[PDB]
Protein backbone atom coordinates (compact mmCIF):
# COMPACT_ATOMS: atom_id res chain seq x y z
CA UNK A 1 0.00 0.00 0.00
CA UNK A 2 2.93 2.46 -0.16
CA UNK A 3 2.75 4.00 -3.65
CA UNK A 4 5.13 2.72 -6.32
CA UNK A 5 5.83 2.69 -10.03
CA UNK A 6 6.86 -0.24 -12.18
CA UNK A 7 10.63 -0.29 -12.68
CA UNK A 8 10.29 -1.18 -16.38
CA UNK A 9 12.45 1.04 -18.54
CA UNK A 10 11.09 3.26 -21.26
CA UNK A 11 11.92 0.66 -23.91
CA UNK A 12 10.21 -2.11 -21.87
CA UNK A 13 6.84 -0.31 -21.83
CA UNK A 14 3.95 -0.32 -24.27
CA UNK A 15 1.28 2.19 -25.24
CA UNK A 16 -2.07 2.07 -23.46
CA UNK A 17 -3.94 3.52 -26.44
CA UNK A 18 -2.67 1.03 -29.08
CA UNK A 19 -0.57 -2.14 -28.98
CA UNK A 20 2.77 -0.50 -29.81
CA UNK A 21 6.08 -0.05 -28.00
CA UNK A 22 6.91 3.26 -26.32
CA UNK A 23 9.72 4.84 -28.37
CA UNK A 24 9.91 8.36 -26.85
CA UNK A 25 8.84 10.73 -24.15
CA UNK A 26 7.19 13.75 -25.75
CA UNK A 27 6.02 17.15 -24.52
CA UNK A 28 4.01 19.95 -26.12
CA UNK A 29 1.91 22.96 -25.05
CA UNK A 30 -1.78 22.17 -24.48
CA UNK A 31 -2.96 25.36 -26.21
CA UNK A 32 -6.03 24.73 -28.41
CA UNK A 33 -6.09 21.03 -27.48
CA UNK A 34 -8.58 19.18 -25.42
CA UNK A 35 -6.56 16.20 -24.21
CA UNK A 36 -9.18 13.63 -23.27
CA UNK A 37 -8.11 10.13 -24.24
CA UNK A 38 -10.33 7.26 -23.02
CA UNK A 39 -7.87 4.37 -23.25
CA UNK A 40 -4.96 4.35 -20.80
CA UNK A 41 -7.00 6.14 -18.16
CA UNK A 42 -6.27 5.04 -14.61
CA UNK A 43 -5.95 7.16 -11.47
CA UNK A 44 -2.76 6.49 -9.53
CA UNK A 45 -4.86 4.87 -6.78
CA UNK A 46 -6.29 2.35 -9.27
CA UNK A 47 -9.59 3.58 -10.70
CA UNK A 48 -9.97 2.68 -14.40
CA UNK A 49 -11.89 5.20 -16.49
CA UNK A 50 -13.24 5.67 -20.00
CA UNK A 51 -12.87 2.59 -22.22
CA UNK A 52 -9.71 1.43 -20.44
CA UNK A 53 -9.28 -2.33 -19.88
CA UNK A 54 -6.29 -4.38 -18.77
CA UNK A 55 -5.42 -6.63 -21.71
CA UNK A 56 -2.58 -5.05 -23.69
CA UNK A 57 -3.23 -6.91 -26.94
CA UNK A 58 -6.94 -5.97 -26.84
CA UNK A 59 -6.52 -2.19 -27.12
CA UNK A 60 -8.22 -1.05 -30.36
CA UNK A 61 -9.47 -4.59 -31.05
CA UNK A 62 -13.09 -5.42 -31.81
CA UNK A 63 -14.91 -8.71 -31.51
CA UNK A 64 -18.37 -9.89 -32.58
CA UNK A 65 -20.47 -11.15 -35.48
CA UNK A 66 -19.72 -10.13 -39.04
CA UNK A 67 -22.62 -9.07 -41.29
CA UNK A 68 -23.23 -9.08 -45.08
CA UNK A 69 -21.11 -7.03 -47.49
CA UNK A 70 -22.40 -3.90 -49.23
CA UNK A 71 -20.60 -1.62 -51.66
CA UNK A 72 -19.05 1.66 -50.50
CA UNK A 73 -10.30 3.13 -52.97
CA UNK A 74 -9.50 -0.60 -53.07
CA UNK A 75 -11.21 -1.01 -49.71
CA UNK A 76 -14.72 -0.60 -51.07
CA UNK A 77 -16.83 -3.27 -49.35
CA UNK A 78 -18.49 -2.47 -46.03
CA UNK A 79 -19.34 -5.08 -43.44
CA UNK A 80 -20.84 -4.38 -40.04
CA UNK A 81 -19.50 -5.94 -36.88
CA UNK A 82 -22.17 -6.43 -34.23
CA UNK A 83 -19.98 -6.19 -31.16
CA UNK A 84 -19.45 -8.36 -28.10
CA UNK A 85 -17.17 -7.60 -25.18
CA UNK A 86 -13.55 -8.61 -25.87
CA UNK A 87 -13.97 -11.72 -23.70
CA UNK A 88 -16.92 -12.81 -25.89
CA UNK A 89 -19.60 -12.06 -23.29
CA UNK A 90 -22.65 -10.05 -24.46
CA UNK A 91 -22.03 -6.31 -24.77
CA UNK A 92 -24.28 -4.16 -22.58
CA UNK A 93 -24.86 -0.77 -24.25
CA UNK A 94 -26.17 0.60 -20.91
CA UNK A 95 -22.90 0.17 -18.91
CA UNK A 96 -21.38 3.37 -17.48
CA UNK A 97 -18.69 3.59 -20.19
CA UNK A 98 -18.23 5.64 -23.39
CA UNK A 99 -18.15 2.53 -25.58
CA UNK A 100 -17.25 -1.16 -25.55
CA UNK A 101 -13.99 -1.46 -23.60
CA UNK A 102 -10.90 -1.26 -25.84
CA UNK A 103 -12.59 0.83 -28.55
CA UNK A 104 -10.31 3.31 -30.30
CA UNK A 105 -10.37 6.77 -28.70
CA UNK A 106 -9.20 8.80 -31.70
CA UNK A 107 -10.51 9.97 -35.06
CA UNK A 108 -8.76 7.95 -37.72
CA UNK A 109 -8.69 4.78 -39.77
CA UNK A 110 -7.37 1.71 -37.99
CA UNK A 111 -5.67 -0.72 -40.34
CA UNK A 112 -5.45 -4.32 -39.31
CA UNK A 113 -6.67 -7.86 -39.89
CA UNK A 114 -10.26 -9.05 -39.72
CA UNK A 115 -10.18 -12.77 -38.94
CA UNK A 116 -12.92 -15.37 -38.56
CA UNK A 117 -13.36 -18.80 -37.06
CA UNK A 118 -16.79 -20.11 -38.04
CA UNK A 119 -19.01 -22.21 -35.83
CA UNK A 120 -17.78 -25.19 -37.90
CA UNK A 121 -14.10 -24.28 -37.32
CA UNK A 122 -13.33 -22.99 -40.85
CA UNK A 123 -11.08 -19.92 -40.66
CA UNK A 124 -10.13 -16.96 -42.83
CA UNK A 125 -8.41 -13.61 -42.32
CA UNK A 126 -7.72 -10.59 -44.48
CA UNK A 127 -6.78 -6.91 -44.35
CA UNK A 128 -9.45 -4.55 -43.08
CA UNK A 129 -9.91 -0.93 -42.04
CA UNK A 130 -12.14 0.54 -39.35
CA UNK A 131 -12.81 4.22 -39.89
CA UNK A 132 -13.69 5.70 -36.51
CA UNK A 133 -15.08 8.86 -38.14
CA UNK A 134 -17.90 7.08 -40.00
CA UNK A 135 -21.48 7.87 -39.12
CA UNK A 136 -21.98 4.15 -38.35
CA UNK A 137 -18.95 3.94 -36.08
CA UNK A 138 -21.12 3.45 -33.00
CA UNK A 139 -19.33 1.19 -30.48
CA UNK A 140 -21.47 2.64 -27.65
CA UNK A 141 -24.51 1.21 -29.39
CA UNK A 142 -22.50 -1.91 -30.28
CA UNK A 143 -21.96 -1.55 -34.05
CA UNK A 144 -18.99 -0.56 -36.16
CA UNK A 145 -18.32 -0.75 -39.88
CA UNK A 146 -15.28 -2.53 -41.26
CA UNK A 147 -14.12 -1.71 -44.77
CA UNK A 148 -12.49 -4.50 -46.78
CA UNK A 149 -11.15 -5.27 -50.25
CA UNK A 150 -11.41 -9.06 -50.04
CA UNK A 151 -14.68 -10.79 -50.93
CA UNK A 152 -13.71 -13.88 -48.88
CA UNK A 153 -15.68 -13.15 -45.67
CA UNK A 154 -18.63 -15.03 -44.17
CA UNK A 155 -21.72 -13.23 -42.80
CA UNK A 156 -23.34 -14.39 -39.55
CA UNK A 157 -20.07 -15.86 -38.30
CA UNK A 158 -17.75 -14.68 -35.55
CA UNK A 159 -14.99 -12.20 -36.27
CA UNK A 160 -12.11 -10.44 -34.58
CA UNK A 161 -10.40 -7.23 -35.67
CA UNK A 162 -6.72 -7.10 -34.70
CA UNK A 163 -5.32 -3.55 -35.07
CA UNK A 164 -1.87 -3.05 -36.63
CA UNK A 165 -1.69 0.67 -37.46
CA UNK A 166 -3.27 3.48 -39.45
CA UNK A 167 -5.11 3.08 -42.71
CA UNK A 168 -5.74 6.64 -43.85
CA UNK A 169 -4.11 8.44 -46.78
CA UNK A 170 -2.47 11.38 -44.97
CA UNK A 171 -1.88 13.10 -41.63
CA UNK A 172 -5.27 14.88 -41.78
CA UNK A 173 -6.99 11.46 -41.63
CA UNK A 174 -5.58 10.97 -38.11
CA UNK A 175 -6.48 13.26 -35.22
CA UNK A 176 -5.19 11.60 -32.07
CA UNK A 177 -6.79 14.06 -29.65
CA UNK A 178 -10.18 14.17 -31.42
CA UNK A 179 -12.61 11.72 -29.83
CA UNK A 180 -14.85 9.72 -32.10
CA UNK A 181 -18.59 10.06 -31.76
CA UNK A 182 -18.97 6.76 -29.90
CA UNK A 183 -22.78 6.66 -30.38
CA UNK A 184 -22.63 7.41 -34.12
CA UNK A 185 -22.95 10.65 -36.07
CA UNK A 186 -24.73 13.52 -34.32
CA UNK A 187 -24.77 11.83 -30.87
CA UNK A 188 -23.20 13.00 -27.60
CA UNK A 189 -20.41 11.04 -25.93
CA UNK A 190 -21.07 9.75 -22.43
CA UNK A 191 -19.20 8.50 -19.38
CA UNK A 192 -15.93 10.15 -20.49
CA UNK A 193 -12.75 10.19 -18.49
CA UNK A 194 -12.23 13.93 -17.97
CA UNK A 195 -9.83 16.17 -19.93
CA UNK A 196 -6.33 16.58 -18.47
CA UNK A 197 -4.16 19.67 -18.30
CA UNK A 198 -1.29 21.16 -16.30
CA UNK A 199 -2.42 23.37 -13.42
CA UNK A 200 0.91 25.06 -12.58
CA UNK A 201 1.48 27.94 -15.02
CA UNK A 202 4.13 27.15 -17.62
CA UNK A 203 4.00 23.37 -17.17
CA UNK A 204 3.27 20.99 -20.07
CA UNK A 205 1.96 17.45 -20.27
CA UNK A 206 4.56 14.73 -20.78
CA UNK A 207 3.41 11.76 -22.87
CA UNK A 208 4.63 8.24 -23.52
CA UNK A 209 4.85 8.22 -27.32
CA UNK A 210 4.62 5.46 -29.94
CA UNK A 211 4.83 5.53 -33.70
CA UNK A 212 2.22 3.43 -35.51
CA UNK A 213 2.59 1.61 -38.81
CA UNK A 214 0.65 3.04 -41.76
CA UNK A 215 -0.81 1.56 -44.91
CA UNK A 216 -0.46 4.68 -47.05
CA UNK A 217 0.81 8.23 -47.34
CA UNK A 218 3.50 10.23 -45.61
CA UNK A 219 1.98 9.60 -42.19
CA UNK A 220 3.82 10.25 -38.91
CA UNK A 221 1.57 7.94 -36.91
CA UNK A 222 2.55 9.44 -33.56
CA UNK A 223 0.36 8.35 -30.65
CA UNK A 224 0.69 9.75 -27.12
CA UNK A 225 -0.63 8.07 -23.99
CA UNK A 226 -0.86 9.46 -20.47
CA UNK A 227 0.37 6.28 -18.82
CA UNK A 228 1.86 3.17 -20.45
CA UNK A 229 -0.25 0.00 -20.27
CA UNK A 230 1.96 -1.48 -17.53
CA UNK A 231 1.45 1.53 -15.24
CA UNK A 232 -2.30 1.15 -15.74
CA UNK A 233 -2.02 -2.53 -14.72
CA UNK A 234 0.24 -1.70 -11.77
CA UNK A 235 -2.01 1.05 -10.31
CA UNK A 236 -5.08 -1.13 -10.76
CA UNK A 237 -3.48 -4.02 -8.83
CA UNK A 238 -1.76 -1.92 -6.15
CA UNK A 239 -4.56 0.60 -5.54
CA UNK A 240 -2.21 2.46 -3.21
CA UNK A 241 -3.73 5.40 -1.28
CA UNK A 242 -2.65 8.75 -2.74
CA UNK A 243 -1.23 10.88 0.12
CA UNK A 244 -1.53 14.05 -1.97
CA UNK A 245 -2.73 15.01 -5.46
CA UNK A 246 0.83 15.12 -6.81
CA UNK A 247 3.54 12.46 -6.76
CA UNK A 248 6.99 13.80 -7.55
CA UNK A 249 8.86 11.44 -9.86
CA UNK A 250 12.33 11.49 -11.33
CA UNK A 251 13.71 9.99 -14.48
CA UNK A 252 17.02 8.20 -13.85
CA UNK A 253 20.05 7.57 -16.07
CA UNK A 254 20.71 3.84 -15.70
CA UNK A 255 24.49 4.15 -16.30
CA UNK A 256 25.25 6.89 -13.77
CA UNK A 257 22.20 6.70 -11.48
CA UNK A 258 21.95 10.47 -11.98
CA UNK A 259 18.56 12.25 -12.06
CA UNK A 260 17.93 13.46 -15.61
CA UNK A 261 14.68 15.33 -14.98
CA UNK A 262 11.76 15.77 -12.55
CA UNK A 263 8.05 15.42 -13.28
CA UNK A 264 4.75 15.55 -11.45
CA UNK A 265 2.56 12.46 -11.60
CA UNK A 266 -0.92 13.79 -10.94
CA UNK A 267 -3.47 11.67 -9.08
CA UNK A 268 -5.85 11.74 -12.08
CA UNK A 269 -3.18 9.74 -13.99
CA UNK A 270 -0.86 11.89 -16.10
CA UNK A 271 2.53 13.61 -15.98
CA UNK A 272 3.56 17.26 -16.27
CA UNK A 273 6.98 18.85 -16.67
CA UNK A 274 8.50 22.33 -16.55
CA UNK A 275 9.17 22.62 -20.28
CA UNK A 276 8.19 24.86 -23.19
CA UNK A 277 7.56 23.75 -26.77
CA UNK A 278 6.92 20.62 -28.80
CA UNK A 279 9.68 18.00 -28.80
CA UNK A 280 10.76 14.49 -27.96
CA UNK A 281 13.03 14.23 -24.92
CA UNK A 282 16.66 13.26 -25.48
CA UNK A 283 17.14 10.66 -22.76
CA UNK A 284 18.36 7.06 -22.67
CA UNK A 285 15.56 4.69 -23.68
CA UNK A 286 16.78 2.33 -20.93
CA UNK A 287 16.20 5.03 -18.28
CA UNK A 288 13.27 4.79 -15.87
CA UNK A 289 11.02 6.76 -13.53
CA UNK A 290 11.44 6.58 -9.74
CA UNK A 291 8.78 7.79 -7.27
CA UNK A 292 10.33 10.37 -4.91
CA UNK A 293 7.71 11.85 -2.63
CA UNK A 294 4.30 13.38 -2.27
CA UNK A 295 4.20 17.14 -2.89
CA UNK A 296 1.51 19.79 -3.54
CA UNK A 297 0.41 21.78 -6.60
CA UNK A 298 2.75 24.67 -5.66
CA UNK A 299 5.88 22.49 -6.07
CA UNK A 300 8.22 24.07 -8.63
CA UNK A 301 9.83 21.52 -10.95
CA UNK A 302 13.37 21.99 -12.13
CA UNK A 303 13.37 23.02 -15.82
CA UNK A 304 13.42 19.90 -18.02
CA UNK A 305 15.60 21.25 -20.82
CA UNK A 306 16.10 18.60 -23.55
CA UNK A 307 15.86 15.87 -20.91
CA UNK B 1 14.95 -10.38 2.01
CA UNK B 2 12.49 -9.66 -0.85
CA UNK B 3 9.01 -11.18 -0.40
CA UNK B 4 7.48 -13.14 -3.28
CA UNK B 5 4.17 -12.24 -4.89
CA UNK B 6 2.04 -12.83 -7.95
CA UNK B 7 0.18 -10.24 -9.95
CA UNK B 8 -3.47 -10.14 -8.88
CA UNK B 9 -4.69 -9.93 -12.49
CA UNK B 10 -7.44 -12.44 -13.23
CA UNK B 11 -7.17 -15.08 -15.92
CA UNK B 12 -9.10 -12.88 -18.38
CA UNK B 13 -6.86 -9.88 -17.60
CA UNK B 14 -3.68 -11.76 -18.66
CA UNK B 15 -2.01 -12.19 -22.03
CA UNK B 16 0.14 -14.87 -23.64
CA UNK B 17 3.93 -14.56 -23.44
CA UNK B 18 4.50 -16.51 -26.68
CA UNK B 19 2.18 -14.41 -28.91
CA UNK B 20 0.17 -11.21 -28.42
CA UNK B 21 -3.16 -12.87 -27.55
CA UNK B 22 -5.44 -12.95 -24.49
CA UNK B 23 -5.38 -15.95 -22.18
CA UNK B 24 -8.70 -17.77 -22.61
CA UNK B 25 -8.11 -21.03 -20.67
CA UNK B 26 -5.93 -23.00 -18.34
CA UNK B 27 -4.95 -26.27 -19.99
CA UNK B 28 -3.22 -29.46 -18.85
CA UNK B 29 -1.89 -32.51 -20.70
CA UNK B 30 0.60 -35.37 -20.16
CA UNK B 31 4.17 -34.57 -21.23
CA UNK B 32 4.63 -38.03 -22.79
CA UNK B 33 6.50 -37.79 -26.12
CA UNK B 34 6.79 -34.00 -25.85
CA UNK B 35 9.83 -31.92 -25.28
CA UNK B 36 8.34 -28.76 -23.80
CA UNK B 37 10.96 -26.13 -24.42
CA UNK B 38 9.45 -22.79 -25.41
CA UNK B 39 11.86 -19.88 -25.67
CA UNK B 40 9.41 -17.00 -25.28
CA UNK B 41 7.74 -16.51 -21.89
CA UNK B 42 10.74 -17.93 -20.07
CA UNK B 43 11.38 -16.23 -16.74
CA UNK B 44 12.41 -17.78 -13.42
CA UNK B 45 10.23 -16.71 -10.47
CA UNK B 46 13.18 -14.70 -9.12
CA UNK B 47 13.44 -12.72 -12.35
CA UNK B 48 15.93 -14.29 -14.80
CA UNK B 49 14.81 -14.03 -18.43
CA UNK B 50 15.85 -16.88 -20.71
CA UNK B 51 15.71 -17.92 -24.37
CA UNK B 52 14.34 -15.23 -26.70
CA UNK B 53 12.13 -13.71 -23.94
CA UNK B 54 11.81 -9.92 -23.85
CA UNK B 55 9.45 -7.64 -21.93
CA UNK B 56 7.39 -5.80 -24.54
CA UNK B 57 4.04 -7.60 -24.92
CA UNK B 58 3.27 -6.29 -28.41
CA UNK B 59 6.74 -7.30 -29.67
CA UNK B 60 6.38 -11.06 -29.18
CA UNK B 61 6.63 -12.73 -32.64
CA UNK B 62 7.32 -9.36 -34.32
CA UNK B 63 10.31 -8.76 -36.58
CA UNK B 64 11.99 -5.54 -37.58
CA UNK B 65 14.65 -4.63 -40.13
CA UNK B 66 15.34 -3.85 -43.77
CA UNK B 67 13.24 -5.38 -46.53
CA UNK B 68 14.95 -6.88 -49.59
CA UNK B 69 13.92 -7.42 -53.24
CA UNK B 70 11.11 -9.79 -54.24
CA UNK B 71 11.65 -13.17 -55.89
CA UNK B 72 9.08 -15.74 -56.98
CA UNK B 73 8.25 -18.76 -54.81
CA UNK B 74 -0.33 -19.98 -54.46
CA UNK B 75 -1.53 -16.39 -53.81
CA UNK B 76 1.35 -15.73 -51.35
CA UNK B 77 4.01 -16.45 -53.93
CA UNK B 78 6.55 -13.65 -53.62
CA UNK B 79 9.44 -13.99 -51.18
CA UNK B 80 11.21 -11.04 -49.56
CA UNK B 81 14.01 -11.29 -47.03
CA UNK B 82 14.06 -9.20 -43.87
CA UNK B 83 17.56 -8.40 -42.65
CA UNK B 84 16.82 -8.11 -38.96
CA UNK B 85 17.52 -5.49 -36.32
CA UNK B 86 16.67 -5.73 -32.65
CA UNK B 87 13.07 -4.74 -31.93
CA UNK B 88 14.22 -1.35 -30.61
CA UNK B 89 15.97 -0.68 -33.95
CA UNK B 90 19.53 -1.11 -32.62
CA UNK B 91 21.87 -3.38 -34.65
CA UNK B 92 21.30 -7.10 -34.13
CA UNK B 93 24.33 -8.96 -32.76
CA UNK B 94 24.33 -12.56 -34.01
CA UNK B 95 26.94 -13.46 -31.32
CA UNK B 96 24.75 -12.66 -28.25
CA UNK B 97 24.08 -15.55 -25.84
CA UNK B 98 20.52 -16.07 -27.14
CA UNK B 99 18.87 -18.57 -29.50
CA UNK B 100 17.78 -15.83 -31.90
CA UNK B 101 16.82 -12.15 -32.06
CA UNK B 102 14.65 -11.46 -29.01
CA UNK B 103 10.93 -11.90 -29.73
CA UNK B 104 11.42 -14.44 -32.54
CA UNK B 105 8.70 -17.06 -32.79
CA UNK B 106 9.55 -20.24 -30.86
CA UNK B 107 7.33 -22.67 -32.78
CA UNK B 108 7.21 -24.37 -36.18
CA UNK B 109 4.42 -22.75 -38.16
CA UNK B 110 3.37 -19.92 -40.45
CA UNK B 111 2.82 -16.58 -38.76
CA UNK B 112 0.20 -14.47 -40.54
CA UNK B 113 0.30 -10.75 -40.07
CA UNK B 114 1.09 -7.37 -41.60
CA UNK B 115 4.36 -6.28 -43.11
CA UNK B 116 4.50 -2.49 -42.93
CA UNK B 117 7.07 0.06 -44.10
CA UNK B 118 7.96 3.66 -43.44
CA UNK B 119 10.63 4.70 -45.94
CA UNK B 120 13.50 7.05 -45.20
CA UNK B 121 11.41 9.73 -46.98
CA UNK B 122 8.34 9.00 -44.82
CA UNK B 123 6.23 7.21 -47.48
CA UNK B 124 4.37 4.27 -45.93
CA UNK B 125 2.71 1.05 -47.03
CA UNK B 126 1.46 -2.13 -45.36
CA UNK B 127 0.05 -5.41 -46.57
CA UNK B 128 -0.64 -8.99 -45.53
CA UNK B 129 2.38 -11.22 -45.13
CA UNK B 130 3.35 -14.65 -43.85
CA UNK B 131 6.53 -15.76 -42.13
CA UNK B 132 7.06 -19.52 -42.33
CA UNK B 133 9.31 -20.49 -39.41
CA UNK B 134 10.02 -23.90 -40.98
CA UNK B 135 11.74 -22.49 -44.09
CA UNK B 136 15.40 -23.26 -44.69
CA UNK B 137 16.04 -19.47 -44.74
CA UNK B 138 14.22 -18.83 -41.48
CA UNK B 139 17.43 -17.92 -39.67
CA UNK B 140 16.77 -15.28 -37.01
CA UNK B 141 19.94 -16.35 -35.15
CA UNK B 142 21.94 -15.30 -38.20
CA UNK B 143 19.63 -12.28 -38.61
CA UNK B 144 17.61 -13.19 -41.72
CA UNK B 145 14.03 -14.40 -42.23
CA UNK B 146 11.88 -14.76 -45.31
CA UNK B 147 8.48 -13.10 -45.58
CA UNK B 148 6.01 -14.40 -48.15
CA UNK B 149 3.64 -11.89 -49.73
CA UNK B 150 0.95 -11.58 -52.40
CA UNK B 151 1.20 -7.83 -52.88
CA UNK B 152 3.77 -6.35 -55.26
CA UNK B 153 3.61 -2.97 -53.48
CA UNK B 154 6.74 -3.28 -51.29
CA UNK B 155 10.01 -1.31 -51.43
CA UNK B 156 13.42 -2.94 -51.19
CA UNK B 157 16.19 -1.37 -49.10
CA UNK B 158 13.68 0.38 -46.88
CA UNK B 159 12.71 -0.30 -43.26
CA UNK B 160 9.98 -2.79 -42.40
CA UNK B 161 8.11 -4.19 -39.43
CA UNK B 162 6.23 -7.48 -39.27
CA UNK B 163 3.30 -7.38 -36.85
CA UNK B 164 1.98 -10.88 -36.07
CA UNK B 165 -1.78 -11.50 -35.98
CA UNK B 166 -2.18 -15.30 -36.10
CA UNK B 167 -1.46 -18.41 -38.12
CA UNK B 168 -1.14 -18.58 -41.88
CA UNK B 169 -0.93 -22.29 -42.64
CA UNK B 170 -3.59 -24.48 -44.27
CA UNK B 171 -4.23 -27.04 -41.52
CA UNK B 172 -3.32 -28.20 -38.01
CA UNK B 173 -0.22 -30.09 -39.27
CA UNK B 174 1.27 -26.74 -40.41
CA UNK B 175 1.46 -25.67 -36.74
CA UNK B 176 3.57 -27.52 -34.16
CA UNK B 177 3.66 -25.38 -31.04
CA UNK B 178 6.20 -27.46 -29.13
CA UNK B 179 8.54 -27.96 -32.12
CA UNK B 180 11.33 -25.37 -32.06
CA UNK B 181 12.36 -23.79 -35.32
CA UNK B 182 15.91 -24.22 -36.52
CA UNK B 183 16.89 -20.68 -35.52
CA UNK B 184 20.15 -20.77 -37.54
CA UNK B 185 18.50 -22.06 -40.73
CA UNK B 186 18.09 -25.57 -42.14
CA UNK B 187 20.53 -28.20 -40.87
CA UNK B 188 21.94 -26.00 -38.04
CA UNK B 189 21.93 -26.59 -34.27
CA UNK B 190 20.02 -24.33 -31.88
CA UNK B 191 22.00 -22.54 -29.19
CA UNK B 192 21.49 -20.80 -25.88
CA UNK B 193 18.13 -22.49 -25.27
CA UNK B 194 16.07 -22.12 -22.14
CA UNK B 195 15.94 -25.71 -20.87
CA UNK B 196 13.03 -28.16 -21.30
CA UNK B 197 10.47 -28.21 -18.47
CA UNK B 198 8.69 -31.18 -16.96
CA UNK B 199 6.94 -32.26 -13.76
CA UNK B 200 9.24 -33.98 -11.27
CA UNK B 201 6.61 -35.47 -8.93
CA UNK B 202 5.31 -38.69 -10.52
CA UNK B 203 1.84 -38.32 -12.02
CA UNK B 204 1.88 -34.52 -12.12
CA UNK B 205 1.26 -32.61 -15.37
CA UNK B 206 2.21 -29.16 -16.59
CA UNK B 207 -0.51 -26.50 -16.41
CA UNK B 208 -0.43 -23.92 -19.21
CA UNK B 209 -1.94 -20.50 -19.84
CA UNK B 210 -3.68 -21.07 -23.18
CA UNK B 211 -4.67 -18.74 -26.04
CA UNK B 212 -6.38 -19.36 -29.33
CA UNK B 213 -4.84 -17.62 -32.33
CA UNK B 214 -6.61 -16.31 -35.42
CA UNK B 215 -6.01 -18.22 -38.65
CA UNK B 216 -6.01 -17.28 -42.31
CA UNK B 217 -7.16 -20.68 -43.57
CA UNK B 218 -8.30 -24.18 -42.75
CA UNK B 219 -9.98 -25.79 -39.78
CA UNK B 220 -7.19 -24.70 -37.47
CA UNK B 221 -7.47 -24.80 -33.69
CA UNK B 222 -4.64 -22.30 -33.16
CA UNK B 223 -4.10 -23.27 -29.53
CA UNK B 224 -0.96 -21.83 -27.98
CA UNK B 225 0.25 -22.65 -24.46
CA UNK B 226 2.65 -20.54 -22.43
CA UNK B 227 4.34 -21.38 -19.13
CA UNK B 228 3.71 -17.94 -17.62
CA UNK B 229 1.58 -15.06 -18.93
CA UNK B 230 3.45 -11.97 -20.11
CA UNK B 231 2.45 -10.03 -17.00
CA UNK B 232 3.96 -12.64 -14.68
CA UNK B 233 7.18 -12.46 -16.74
CA UNK B 234 7.20 -8.65 -16.27
CA UNK B 235 6.32 -8.92 -12.56
CA UNK B 236 9.03 -11.47 -11.71
CA UNK B 237 11.61 -9.50 -13.71
CA UNK B 238 10.82 -6.29 -11.78
CA UNK B 239 10.39 -7.87 -8.34
CA UNK B 240 13.27 -10.34 -8.54
CA UNK B 241 12.10 -11.69 -5.19
CA UNK B 242 13.92 -14.27 -3.08
CA UNK B 243 12.85 -17.83 -3.92
CA UNK B 244 12.89 -19.40 -0.46
CA UNK B 245 12.47 -22.84 -2.03
CA UNK B 246 12.19 -24.35 -5.54
CA UNK B 247 8.41 -24.63 -5.25
CA UNK B 248 5.82 -22.02 -4.50
CA UNK B 249 2.41 -23.44 -3.62
CA UNK B 250 -0.32 -21.46 -5.34
CA UNK B 251 -4.09 -21.76 -5.29
CA UNK B 252 -6.66 -20.74 -7.84
CA UNK B 253 -9.54 -18.87 -6.24
CA UNK B 254 -13.21 -18.51 -7.17
CA UNK B 255 -13.83 -14.75 -7.09
CA UNK B 256 -17.55 -15.07 -6.14
CA UNK B 257 -17.18 -17.44 -3.18
CA UNK B 258 -13.49 -17.00 -2.27
CA UNK B 259 -13.28 -20.80 -2.34
CA UNK B 260 -10.08 -22.59 -3.42
CA UNK B 261 -10.81 -24.32 -6.72
CA UNK B 262 -7.46 -26.11 -7.09
CA UNK B 263 -3.80 -26.17 -5.99
CA UNK B 264 -0.71 -25.97 -8.17
CA UNK B 265 3.05 -25.84 -7.82
CA UNK B 266 4.82 -22.83 -9.27
CA UNK B 267 8.32 -24.09 -9.89
CA UNK B 268 11.28 -21.73 -9.58
CA UNK B 269 12.31 -22.39 -13.23
CA UNK B 270 9.01 -20.66 -14.17
CA UNK B 271 6.17 -23.09 -14.83
CA UNK B 272 3.19 -24.70 -13.08
CA UNK B 273 2.33 -28.33 -12.37
CA UNK B 274 -0.88 -29.94 -11.12
CA UNK B 275 -2.06 -33.36 -9.92
CA UNK B 276 -4.15 -34.19 -12.96
CA UNK B 277 -4.30 -36.85 -15.67
CA UNK B 278 -5.23 -36.31 -19.31
CA UNK B 279 -5.57 -33.54 -21.88
CA UNK B 280 -8.22 -30.92 -21.15
CA UNK B 281 -9.04 -27.28 -20.48
CA UNK B 282 -9.91 -26.55 -16.86
CA UNK B 283 -13.51 -25.64 -16.10
CA UNK B 284 -12.99 -22.60 -13.89
CA UNK B 285 -14.24 -19.00 -13.89
CA UNK B 286 -12.15 -16.82 -16.22
CA UNK B 287 -12.32 -14.06 -13.58
CA UNK B 288 -10.62 -16.33 -11.02
CA UNK B 289 -7.02 -15.75 -9.96
CA UNK B 290 -3.97 -17.40 -8.45
CA UNK B 291 -2.94 -16.65 -4.87
CA UNK B 292 0.54 -17.44 -3.53
CA UNK B 293 0.16 -19.66 -0.41
CA UNK B 294 3.56 -20.73 0.85
CA UNK B 295 6.95 -22.18 0.01
CA UNK B 296 6.99 -25.99 -0.06
CA UNK B 297 9.37 -28.65 -1.40
CA UNK B 298 9.23 -31.13 -4.30
CA UNK B 299 7.68 -33.82 -2.04
CA UNK B 300 4.51 -31.80 -1.47
CA UNK B 301 1.47 -33.77 -2.59
CA UNK B 302 -1.09 -31.62 -4.43
CA UNK B 303 -4.78 -32.25 -4.03
CA UNK B 304 -6.19 -33.85 -7.20
CA UNK B 305 -7.27 -31.12 -9.63
CA UNK B 306 -10.31 -32.87 -11.10
CA UNK B 307 -11.98 -30.62 -13.71
CA UNK B 308 -10.79 -27.51 -11.89
Numbering used by the authors:
A (entry chain A): 225 to 296, 306 to 540
B (entry chain B): 224 to 296, 306 to 540
Tell me what the authors wrote about this structure, in their words.
NoVs recognize specific glycan ligands as host attachment factors or receptors for infection. NoVs interact with HBGAs or other glycans through their capsid protrusions that are built by the dimeric protruding (P) domain of NoV capsid protein (VP1). Genogroup II (GII) noroviruses consist of human noroviruses (huNoVs) that generally bind histo-blood group antigens (HBGAs) as host factors and three porcine norovirus (porNoV) genotypes (GII.11/18/19) that form a genetic lineage lacking HBGA-binding ability. In this study, we solved the P protein crystal structures of a GII.11 porNoV (VA34) that was isolated from pig caecum contents in 1997 in Japan and a close-related GII.3 huNoV (TV24) that was isolated in 1977 in the USA, representing one of the earliest huNoV isolates, focusing on their HBSs compared with the previously known ones.
In contrast, the porNoV VA34 P protein did not bind these saliva samples (OD < 0.1) and it did not bind the oligosaccharides representing A, B, and H antigens either (OD < 0.1). Although 10 oligosaccharides representing various HBGAs and a ganglioside were used to co-crystallize with the VA34 P proteins individually, no extra electron density was seen other than the native P protein, consistent with the negative results of HBGA binding assay and glycan array screening. However, the sequence compositions and the structure of the VA34 site corresponding to the HBSs of the TV24 and other GII huNoVs appeared to be conserved (Figures 4 and 7(A and B)), indicating that this site of VA34 is under functional selection over time during evolution. On the other hand, the V451 mutation in the VA34 P protein loses the conserved Van der Waals interaction to the α-Fuc of the HBGAs. Thus, the two mutations damage the structure and function of the HBS and explain the lack of HBGA binding ability of GII.11 porNoV VA34. The primary variations in both sequences and structures between the two P proteins are at the surface loops between β-strands, mainly in the P2 subdomains that form the top surface of the viral protrusions, most likely contributing to the differences in their antigenicity and HBSs. VA34 P protein represents the first solved P protein structure of a GII porNoV.
